[PDB]
């Protein structure tokens, strides 16, 4: 089974940490001096053939007008390679490793206001290219008094600009209520950590400050449990399906119209 996750965030926003938190395994930090935006892809074997693609140097340049271009270029390159597979005479679909991006986690800096202009532009031009799931990176920077207001301003920004974000399927009645809860909590206030502490008497990922210890797997501390519930076999296949029937189909319509 193939599943490819794209992480798009400003440098240092916790992309590598959050992936290690989702799968309980270790998978280098970039510099701020990169002259342009690049992407780093790594595939792991876990049953499941996971591929993690992360942006490099996103948001560090003084001029950020060309930040979306390398990401769209990479997504199209995966759309193109899959199209090359369907056009082979003696093709090997059954053994081909699907490299198309099935989900994009867009990391939003916890500013407490709304969206940055770089967030609005990049997500708007990734609208019809990938299933976008907006998350508030490093959510421990926002008090619960502000998180409610922050989530409202962000959603009002996505609606007013017509940003098409992924929605978990409510057509399946067996898990429609829990998916209706996850859709109501978007954007997910996520926290990641690569080390555990003894809280109560169960070792779990945590971040300790002089004034308290954040519990990553505690639903009252952050929405990490909500984000982890996207890896269910039903929601994970829909992201793979919604990629093939919507976003990849849009790529075909453009390549055929010419």
């Amino acid at each position: 089974f193939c599943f490819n996750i794209l992480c798009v965030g400003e440098t240092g926003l916790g992309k590598s940490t959050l992936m290690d938190t989702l799968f309980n395994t270790k998978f280098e930090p970039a510099t701020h001096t990169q002259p342009g935006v690049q992407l780093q892809s790594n595939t792991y074997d876990l049953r499941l053939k996971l591929t993690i693609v992360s942006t490099v140097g996103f948001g560090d340049q003084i001029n950020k007008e060309d930040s979306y271009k390398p990401i769209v270029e990479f997504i199209d390159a995966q759309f193109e390679a899959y199209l090359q597979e369907e056009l082979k005479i003696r093709r090997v679909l059954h053994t081909y490793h699907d490299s198309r991006i099935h989900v994009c986690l867009y990391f939003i800096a916890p500013t407490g206001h709304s969206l940055k202009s770089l967030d609005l532009v990049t997500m708007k031009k990734l609208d019809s290219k990938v299933n976008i799931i907006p998350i508030i990176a490093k959510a421990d920077a926002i008090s619960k008094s502000e998180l409610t207001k922050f989530k409202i301003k962000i959603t009002s920004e996505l609606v007013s600009n017509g940003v098409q974000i992924y929605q978990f399927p409510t057509d399946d009645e067996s898990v429609a209520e829990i998916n209706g809860t996850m859709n109501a909590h978007l954007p997910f206030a996520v926290i990641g950590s690569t080390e555990e502490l003894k809280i109560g008497n169960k070792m779990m990922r945590a971040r300790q400050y002089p004034w308290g210890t954040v519990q990553v797997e505690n639903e009252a501390h952050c929405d990490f449990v909500k984000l982890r519930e996207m890896l269910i076999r039903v929601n994970m296949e829909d992201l793979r399906e919604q990629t093939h029937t919507r976003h990849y189909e849009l790529y075909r319509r453009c390549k055929l119209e010419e």
């Binding site: 701020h32 202009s117 920077a141 920004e157 002089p210 210890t213």
Partner: protein, 250 residues
């Protein structure tokens, strides 16, 4: 008369910290633009005056996608205050003269990266010969003690290898010793009261603004009150005289 400039990316708690230094709400009617308006947003200059203090804010800094002349609007303001004082010093009414020269600039470093962005380097290298730069680490309550020391040592090294002329403290004994060691100050600001004290409320604990073990608010406030006379002294005797000699090139 003291003039404090505030520069930094939007949403770093700069307004909250300023209102926390003196318990004065200076932004009661400020509106934050939408993400669509920030795309082409230019840098503007707002000056608030309370009592002999003037806080010069620079809204719009970093919000634009293409920093076309992000520093120019700030650099020209600093030079303008030097020019106005220059032409008033050369005038005949030197008795009644207003000193609007920027004495100190707080630059807010983001805590969510690995170090400082190229925008931070370019801006500081553009004004470090004109204003006393005091770097601050915004939103210190997002960094653990280990993460906090890693960022301070990295910023100080990048300052050295880029030759950033930040403001330096001069040479009671424990006050100067502990004050210099905490640079760059990592501060936390708040307008909220929380068994009642100023700070921020989280589900896992309460951050205290005036707790030195939590952040460097008191150190930053103490440094500004004690070095206020020296800040304006270095401005008048060093940054203004360098502008004056550079002005006489043409």
């Amino acid at each position: 008369e003291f003039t404090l400039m505030v520069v930094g990316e939007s949403g770093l708690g700069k307004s909250t910290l300023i209102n926390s230094l003196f318990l004065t709400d200076l932004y009661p009617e400020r509106v934050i633009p939408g993400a669509a308006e920030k795309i082409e947003r230019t840098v503007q200059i707002e000056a608030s005056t309370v009592e002999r203090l003037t806080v010069v804010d620079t809204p719009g800094y970093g919000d634009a996608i293409n920093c076309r002349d992000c520093f120019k609007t700030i650099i020209s303001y600093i030079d303008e205050q030097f020019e106005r004082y220059l032409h008033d010093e050369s005038g005949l009414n030197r008795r009644h003269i207003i000193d609007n020269r920027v004495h100190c600039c707080f630059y807010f470093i983001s805590p969510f990266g690995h170090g400082l962005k190229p925008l931070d380097v370019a801006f500081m290298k553009a004004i470090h010969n004109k204003v006393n730069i005091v770097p601050v680490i915004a939103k210190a309550d997002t960094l653990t003690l280990k993460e906090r020391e890693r960022l301070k040592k990295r910023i100080l090294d990048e300052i050295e290898e880029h030759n950033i002329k930040i403001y330096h403290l001069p040479d009671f004994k424990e006050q100067t010793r502990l004050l210099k060691a905490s640079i760059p100050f990592s501060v936390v600001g708040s307008n909220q009261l929380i068994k009642k004290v100023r700070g921020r409320l989280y589900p896992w604990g309460v951050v205290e603004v005036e707790n030195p073990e939590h952040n460097d608010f008191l150190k930053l406030r103490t440094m500004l009150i004690t070095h206020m006379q020296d800040l304006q002294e270095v401005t008048q005797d060093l940054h203004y005289e360098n502008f004056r000699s550079e002005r006489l090139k043409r």
